Amino acid sequence: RKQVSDGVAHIHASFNNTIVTITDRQGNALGWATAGGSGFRGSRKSTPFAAQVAAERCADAVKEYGIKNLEVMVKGPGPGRESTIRALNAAGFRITNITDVTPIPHNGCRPPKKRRV
Amino acid sequence: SLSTEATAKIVSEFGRDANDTGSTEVQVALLTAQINHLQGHFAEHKKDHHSRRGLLRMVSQRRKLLDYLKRKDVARYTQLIERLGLRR
Amino acid sequence: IKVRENEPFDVALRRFKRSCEKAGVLAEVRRREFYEKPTTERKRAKASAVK
Amino acid sequence: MRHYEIVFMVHPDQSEQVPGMIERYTAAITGAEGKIHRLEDWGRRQLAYPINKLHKAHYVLMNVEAPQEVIDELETTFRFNDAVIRSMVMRTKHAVTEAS
Amino acid sequence: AVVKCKPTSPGRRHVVKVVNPELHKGKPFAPLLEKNSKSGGRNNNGRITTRHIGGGHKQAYRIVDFKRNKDGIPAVVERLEYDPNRSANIALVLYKDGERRYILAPKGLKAGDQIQSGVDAAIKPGNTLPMRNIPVGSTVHNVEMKPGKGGQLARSAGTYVQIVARDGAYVTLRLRSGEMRKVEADCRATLGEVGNAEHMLRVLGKAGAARWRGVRPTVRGTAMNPVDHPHGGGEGRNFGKHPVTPWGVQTKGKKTRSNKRTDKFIVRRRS
Amino acid sequence: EIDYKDIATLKNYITESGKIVPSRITGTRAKYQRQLARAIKRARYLSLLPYTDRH
RNA sequence: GUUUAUUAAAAACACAGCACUGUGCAAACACGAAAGUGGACGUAUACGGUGUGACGCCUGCCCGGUGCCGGAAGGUUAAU
RNA sequence: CUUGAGUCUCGUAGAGGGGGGUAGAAUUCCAGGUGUAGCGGUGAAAUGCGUAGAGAUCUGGAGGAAUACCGGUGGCGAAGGCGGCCCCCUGGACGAAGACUGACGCUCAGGUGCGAAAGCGUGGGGAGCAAACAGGAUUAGAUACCCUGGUAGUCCACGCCGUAAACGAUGUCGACUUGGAGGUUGUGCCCUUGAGGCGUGGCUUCCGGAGCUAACGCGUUAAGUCGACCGCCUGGGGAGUAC
RNA sequence: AGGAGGUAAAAUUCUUCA
């Protein structure tokens, strides 16, 4: 089904799990893959390696469309922030662009408090 | 804060001449002018306390000036209250 | 923020984040709101910036 | 009677009406013995960010020495006029010329 | 404007008047009036179908137009009148043709405004036009469910609807109840909010203050006897029964909605 | 610097992200610093200086 | 204020108020085999049911049983 | 009479105050397209959410509140307190000279006004956050710390409350007394001929003298050295309570 | 060398007079 070549790599790494979704130049998502979905529960997925295999997981599910090259928009800090884009490149994808889209509000909502540990 | 047009105008009505703004009558005159101007200013908003003390300071200022004038020459005092229109 | 590499290389080389955003302004507006407490912190650090 | 920057931008579609705006504007001002020391029309210029959809707008610089009356009732015309997009009046500090 | 009377007498100290200065004082527009009698909670069979209906002060009907078909014809609001039949206020508008009609005077309405209906009417309170031309999100009241019928949604005071969807030839409206019902955009509507909102700020003050309104005393099922109400009579404040109607119908949660015809026009029930 | 329209002089006082560069680097003066920043704030509003590089 | 007309006029009932819940219109509900009508020529600040009963301070603990509001793998299961 | 204290001319800087608009990002809610068994969360899990299609992703819309970067022992005000941008209205402070009034001054019981947050009354609104409360964990016990939800409240108009570690824990005003390093705001002079050079005022920060103090320390803005006036304390608990 | 980020989870109590 289908046969694209240019897409996007919307990754969302956090302090718990890293979700990677390979979409097209339209933003409809062709296939995704999480660090937790491939196992690794708790601190297991809270590591850069969890995102590494996660990328390969999303890769081995989107190549069915013949995705040659695709952009990469990083979102959310935490682990698997750099190792993630380091996988797609080694997966055989022609990296083109890499832009950051981490939601940065100009001081609006009021963040939580409870964290006394 | 009271255009320079009104200020110079008042000075040439109470004092012997121009540049005589230092006169007691001139001061109490230019002060009351604002007290009546800002009078309408506070008529609106009414939530401007910071600028309220200023108006009060202006009145409390002329008030002490009246006691002084009334202290020295009494005639100049009456001829001022009836003209300027105040004290009741 | 963004990087448009040339051709002869694949390495990230995106060490720009470690000089602006990344966490220099993210970690700040992450935990407590502080408010007036920062002043004491900056004043304390500024007191150690002399010697 | 003080100075006002005034720098609004008309929608690219209503660019033919722009030359008319300056007419009524300058007219309403001169009507109250107003002034005018500068009037520039950079024309359809590029935008920095997608404002209210569409790219590139029609900027029209201005500089008038009108009183704090006819100027206050000027924005009401801009807001009511869906044609123009943005609007802004700035400081006073005497008058200027050319530049930009 | 809300007013709180003083304790000049019992049943008058708990009264909170809700008057309006910008409200006309006198007789309404005769040309737009009719009989409008009072039934009494009884049908053609003379049987009291609806309980708690009786008495009340004599009322008259006000010819109000909810369809708003006068398109391309501006109109000026002459004044604002009180409509007993409803909880909102009516506005006697005068179009440029010389025809007068009553309409649910919106929130930001005044005497001397220029309202108009049609697929060209400017997006403002007091104007009516199909939702197919009204921008999404626009708070609208007196919405219709069918193109040509008339406004039936959000007609009370302080109430309002908000368009929040499109898709196809329909649009989802966020009813004041919190439910989102789908209605074909072909249906017209009036931007802005309905009449006053201080209607819910009322508290009457006394019992007789509710009698001349059309409401009669309320009897409890526990006070009545078993032969009259399922809750039995008891022998000193007793119950032991389940909160039901005087006909054997569960209550306090027991839903009684059966349609299946308009369920499709529903997205998310209230909450 | 002395104005906001002179974007050709305020474009070298801001980083690539649009963030206003501190006086610690630019070595600008004191009074001229706030004025320089005040000018940028005005330009940004008039869509003269992008708030962020995300655009 | 109302009530056992004709042994009980009371602490009973009603009561403004408050709360829960049902109801998106051809409403719920009710009178009716049906039509139709009432509810309402009203539209959630509306209406119906229930409970309590101005106001002031407040209204705790408990979901097994009996109901109600949902979900659901498996099991049993009518007509045919 | 003029040196105190004021007025007047011109000019300069500012999150000072009040009112009315406006812009962007993000979060939440909602809708459409694509997509599918996970999502979310923690130290580890779980409650919760999802086959009525979440999360993720793309586009659009509404709403509330707060204004990233600038931003700093930086600025302003009597104190409390005060941060996007623009308009309107407005107080005070300060500087360069000259002129004028001529002690018109300082403080001040009563009294009066203002006065964070929280709370309360009559309404509206309500994204996020979040007492109480509800449901999961931790534990010997957990009416708490932790997690998932969440009302009042926070926001706005008006009317009250007038309470704080409301502090610089130092009342206000005036005069005098060795200095050094910076911030910030005017102004005079000089090939402006260096982005400066040479002086003079207001305000502010750190350190440091004498001196002062029990010590800590403060230290030209004093707790130093003096003068004026008001308030207040006389062991702690009782008690910021009782009448 | 200057700067930024990251980096600890909970775990009580111990008579009186010298």
Q: What are the residue boundaries of the structural domains of chain F, listed by start?
A: 1-55
User: At residue A39, what is the residue type?
Assistant: G
**Which residues have CB under 8 Å from F27's CB, separation 6+?**
none
Q: Where are the beta strands (DSSP E) in chain A?
A: 6-13, 18-24, 31-34, 69-75, 94-100
Per-domain boundaries in chain D: 2-92
**Residues A86/A18, Cβ–Cβ less than 8 Å:** no
Separation of first and last alpha carbons in chain F = 24
**Residues E99/E74, Cβ–Cβ less than 8 Å:** no
Q: Which long-range contacts does E94-97 make (Cβ < 8 Å, 24+ apart)?
A: E95/E70, E97/E70, E97/E73
E139 forms bridges with which residues in the sheet?
A: E162
Which nt has its C1' nearest the CA of E195?
A: G45
How far is it, in rounded angstroms, from Cα A59 to Cα A67?
A: 9
How far is it, in rounded angstroms, from Cα A76 to Cα A40?
A: 19
**Which residues have CB under 8 Å from C6's CB, separation 6+?**
none
Residue A8: other Cβ atoms inside 10 A: 22
Domains of chain B (ranges plus CATH)?
Answer: 1-88 (1.10.287.10)
Instruction: Provide the 3-class DSSP secondary structure of residue B12.
Output: helix
- Measure Cα distances from E62 to B12, E21, E101, E102, E131 in Å: 68, 21, 10, 7, 27
H-helix or E-strand spanning residue F11 = none
CA-closest candidate to residue A10, choices A69, A104, A98: A98
How far is it, in rounded angstroms, from Cα F47 to Cα F41?
A: 10
**Residues A85/A13, Cβ–Cβ less than 8 Å:** no
H-helix or E-strand spanning residue D60 = strand D57-61
CA-closest candidate to residue A51, choices A23, A24, A5, A91: A91
How far is it, in rounded angstroms, from Cα A71 to Cα A5?
A: 11
Q: Where are the alpha helices (DSSP H) in chain B?
A: 4-14, 24-43, 50-71, 74-84
Rg of chain B (C-alpha set): 14
DSSP labels, chain C: --B---SS--S---TTGGGSSTTTTTTTTTS---TTHHHHHHHHHHTSS--
CA-closest candidate to residue E33, choices E93, E87, E104, E85: E85
Nearest residue, CB atoms, C32 vs list A85, A107, A113: A113
Please check whether strand I approaches the CB of C18 to within 7 Å.
yes
CA dihedral E259, E261, E265, E268 (to 10 degrees): 30
Exposure string over C16-42, b if 16+ CB within 10 A, otherwise e: ebeeebbeeeeeeeeeeeeeeeeeeee
Strand H neighbours among F 16-55, CB < 7 A: 18-20, 22-23, 29-31, 33-35, 37-38, 41-42, 45, 51-52
Structure tokens at B16: 């012997």
How far is it, in rounded angstroms, from Cα C26 to Cα C17?
A: 12
**Which residues have CB under 8 Å from A71's CB, separation 6+?**
A7, A8, A9, A96, A97, A98, A99
Nearest residue, CB atoms, C2 vs list A99, A102, A107: A99
- Measure Cα distances from A84 to A64, C24, E235 in Å: 20, 21, 77
- Measure Cα distances from B46 to B36, B53, B58, E198, E199 in Å: 15, 13, 18, 26, 30
- Measure Cα distances from C14 to A54, A95, C41, D42, E148 in Å: 22, 14, 31, 39, 63
Residue F47: other Cβ atoms inside 10 A: 19
H-helix or E-strand spanning residue D10 = strand D7-10
How close F13 comes to chain C (CA, Å)? 15
DSSP labels, chain E: -EEE---SSTTTTT-EEE--TTS--S---GGGEE------SB-TT--B-SSSB-------EE-B-SS---BT--EEEEEEEE-TTSSSEEEEEEETTS-EEEEE--TT--TT-EE-BSTT--SSTT-EEETTTSPTT-EEESB-SSTTT---BS-STT--EEB---STTEEEEE-TTS-EEEEETTSEEEES--S-SGGGG----SSHHHHTTTB-----TTTS-TTTSTT---SSS---S--EETTTEE-SS------SSSGGGEEE---
The residue length of chain E stands at: 271
A95 forms bridges with which residues in the sheet?
A: A70
CA dihedral E79, E82, E83, E89 (to 10 degrees): 60
Q: Does any CB of chain A come closer than 8 Å to the CB of residue C44?
A: no
How far is it, in rounded angstroms, from Cα F33 to Cα E44?
A: 86
The residue length of chain A stands at: 117
Q: Does any CB of chain F come closer than 8 Å to the CB of residue C2?
A: yes
Q: What is the DSSP letter of A74?
A: E
H-helix or E-strand spanning residue D57 = strand D57-61
Q: Where are the alpha helices (DSSP H) in chain D?
A: 18-31, 75-80
- Measure Cα distances from E122 to B33, B73, E125, F21 in Å: 49, 71, 9, 47
How far is it, in rounded angstroms, from Cα E252 to Cα A106?
A: 47
How far is it, in rounded angstroms, from Cα B1 to Cα E7?
A: 49
Separation of first and last alpha carbons in chain E = 31
Please check whether strand I approaches the CB of C20 to within 7 Å.
no
Helix (H) and strand (E) counts in chain D:
2, 3
E94 forms bridges with which residues in the sheet?
A: E76, E100
> What distance lies between CA E207 and its chain's CA centroid?
23
Q: Spell out which residues of chain F touch residue D86, defining contact as CB-CB under 8 Å.
A: 46-47
Instruction: Provide the 3-class DSSP secondary structure of residue F5.
Output: coil
Separation of first and last alpha carbons in chain D = 24
Q: What is the DSSP letter of D20?
A: H
> What distance lies between CA A86 and its chain's CA centroid?
11
- Measure Cα distances from E103 to B86, E173, E190, E194 in Å: 55, 21, 10, 10
How far is it, in rounded angstroms, from Cα A41 to Cα A50?
A: 10
Q: Does any CB of chain D come closer than 8 Å to the CB of residue F37?
A: no
